[PDB]
Paper text:
The netrin protein family is comprised of six members, the secreted netrins -1, -3, -4, -5 and the glycosylphosphatidylinositol (GPI)-anchored netrins-G1 and -G2 in mammals and exhibit homology to the N-terminal domains (LN-LEa1-3) of laminin short arms. Secreted netrins-1,-3 and -5 are homologous to the laminin γ1 chain, whereas [name] (Net4) shares a higher identity to the β1 chain (50%). Thus, our hypothesis is that Net4 is not a classic ligand activating a membrane receptor with a downstream signalling but rather a regulator of basal membrane maintenance, which indirectly impacts key functions such as axonal growth and angiogenesis.
The LN domain forms a β-sandwich jelly-roll motif with a front face composed of sheet S5-S2-S7 and a dorsal face composed of sheet S4-S3-S6-S1. The LN domain is stabilized by a complex pattern of disulfide bridges composed of 12 cysteine residues. Two disulfide bridges between cysteine residues 72–236 and 191–234, absent in any current netrin or laminin structure, hold the S6-S7 loop in place. Furthermore, there is clear electron density for glycan additions at three asparagine-linked glycosylation sites, Asn56, Asn163, and Asn353. Remarkably, Net4 is the first member of the netrin family with no N-linked glycan attachment at the dorsal face of the N-terminal domain.
Author numbering: 30 to 280, 285 to 462
The structure:
């Protein structure tokens, strides 16, 4: 995934549970009929059949909308008899991009219905598009067939055709197809966790029943062949392939998954984060317009840290060039970039600094080593490991009397008046 990228588009309906308030034949078996019209608007002979939820070959559950839209016999969900207020809802186990919807009614399309989304797993909902035979009379909204931008539409509400009639909504409206698809403005429109259809009123086939040997009956019910929800895994443009989301058990389908295989040194379920060691500059979504990747930059830690965090104060201090700060410096290092050895250690020039043994422990003798005020312990020079010795004490470790001194002790070494080479133990010449 070199440049800005995106996973494959697909029907989010597949593999997931579509829910509906009701379905025909909930209790016992039920006779049901369908009525459509021909060119002369005369009612056709109604195909009738039995419905029963307990049996697969008679049931019409909501899941019949999420199945393949091209199988041997067409399948459809069918609500209980005599119901107007109905709701179809699709809950997603993660955040996905929703681009455009296609419903396909077997019965006549509803005289009124609305579509909306939840961006926060069902806590809140916000409209997408209203549908009615008259937007002004039903919802007090303008019709987009005239207003060219309205939120309501009668384009998909005509009783004819009484069967196979489709309802459609496209999130990628003229304003949203241009510009960067990952911008804040577009995410507001595309990103969703749920998708809900609320049917408000049924619609009877207004065809002429002249050729009918019997009056219409057992038809007051909703019916939908397919609930095609085109969309894709959301990854902020830092991925082109997704795996299953943790804890998700799907139900002959081509399922769309949500867990992003993140690229561009990003991380998180949707690449919203930077990789743990790549917080040197602020995260940013890939630019679909520009095609720019906007990939996370690594922190400099000299190989003494595997994690780091951004810092706006350090960021501005560098001149907006770098702001990473290494977390939990390993190998006895200390710096912001783990670039120095801690006190009580020093640079081992024999080794490279990136090496684990870059810093070597100090061997300052506790008694022979002098201590500075406002400190209770001696630490060696980090550059060469030389400890500051008390008077008369010598060496890099201050662990023995200087030449010409004796009586190693907590106050250094006494000068031997030989003078003359000393025996450091007794002071004899
Ligand atoms: C939608 O609005 C109404 C309801 O169907 C209808 O418009 C009526 O008739 C004329 C046509 O423009 C309007 O001036 C009246 O105010 C409406 N009367 C009522 C009682 O609503 C028409 O069916 C539709 N078309 C529109 C409004 O253009
Ligand atoms: C990089 O941009 C500027 C420095 O050139 C940083 O300061 C920002 O300045 C802009 C105006 O140019 C303001 O709108 C921002 O509010 C400033 N940021 C802050 C944190 O005060 C800016 O911070 C840097 N980039 C980022 C992402 O912080
Ligand atoms: C067999 C059956 O479905 N019985 C239901 C019952 O479970 C429910 O509590 C009641 C509420 O109206 O309606 C009836
Ligand atoms: C099934 O019967 C019960 C009454 O005991 C009640 O739920 C209703 O009449 C039937 N169910 C539906 C969904 O209509
Ligand atoms: Ca179907």
């Amino acid at each position: 995934c070199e440049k800005a990228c995106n996973p494959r588009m697909g029907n989010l309906a597949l593999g997931r549970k579509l829910r509906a308030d009701t379905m025909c034949g909930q209790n016992a078996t039920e006779l049901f009929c369908f009525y459509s019209e021909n060119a002369d608007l005369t009612c056709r002979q109604p195909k009738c059949d039995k419905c029963n939820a307990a049996h697969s070959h008679l049931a019409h559950p909501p899941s019949a909308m999420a199945d393949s839209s091209f199988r041997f016999p067409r399948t459809w969900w069918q609500s209980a008899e005599d119901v107007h207020r109905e709701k179809i809802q699709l809950d997603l186990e993660a955040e996905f991009y929703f681009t455009h919807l296609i419903m396909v009614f077997k019965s006549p399309r509803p005289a009124a219905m609305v579509l909306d989304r939840s961006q926060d797993f069902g806590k809140t909902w916000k409209p997408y598009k209203y549908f009615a035979t008259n937007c002004s009379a039903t919802f007090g909204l303008e019709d987009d067939v005239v207003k060219k931008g309205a939120i309501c539409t009668s384009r998909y509400s005509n009783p004819f055709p009484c069967t196979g009639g489709e309802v459609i909504f496209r999130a990628l409206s003229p304003p949203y197809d241009i510009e960067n698809p990952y911008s804040a403005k577009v995410q507001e429109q595309l990103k969703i966790t749920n998708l809900r259809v609320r049917l408000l009123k049924r619609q009877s086939c207004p065809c002429q029943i002249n050729d009918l040997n019997a009056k219409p009956h057992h038809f007051m019910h909703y019916a939908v062949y397919d609930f095609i929800v085109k969309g894709s895994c959301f990854c902020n443009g830092h991925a082109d392939q997704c795996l299953p989301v943790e804890g998700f058990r799907p139900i002959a389908f081509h399922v769309v998954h949500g867990r992003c295989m993140c690229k561009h040194n990003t991380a998180g379920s949707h690449c919203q984060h930077c990789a743990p060691l790549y917080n040197d500059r602020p995260w940013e979504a890939a630019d679909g317009r520009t095609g720019a990747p906007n990939e996370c930059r690594t922190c400099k830690c000299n190989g003494h840290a595997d994690t780091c965090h951004f810092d706006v104060n350090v960021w501005e201090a560098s001149g907006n060039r770098s702001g990473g700060v290494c977390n939990n410096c390993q190998h006895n290092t200390e710096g912001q970039h783990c670039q120095r050895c801690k006190p009580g250690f020093y640079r081992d020039l024999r080794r490279p600094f990136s090496a684990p043994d870059a810093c070597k422990a100090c061997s300052c003798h506790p008694v022979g080593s002098a201590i500075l005020p406002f400190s209770s312990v001696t630490f060696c020079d980090p550059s060469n490991g030389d400890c500051p010795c008390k008077p008369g004490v010598a060496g890099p470790h201050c662990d023995r009397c200087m030449v010409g001194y004796w009586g190693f002790g907590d106050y250094g070494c006494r000068p031997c008046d030989c003078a003359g080479s000393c025996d450091p133990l007794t002071g004899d010449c």
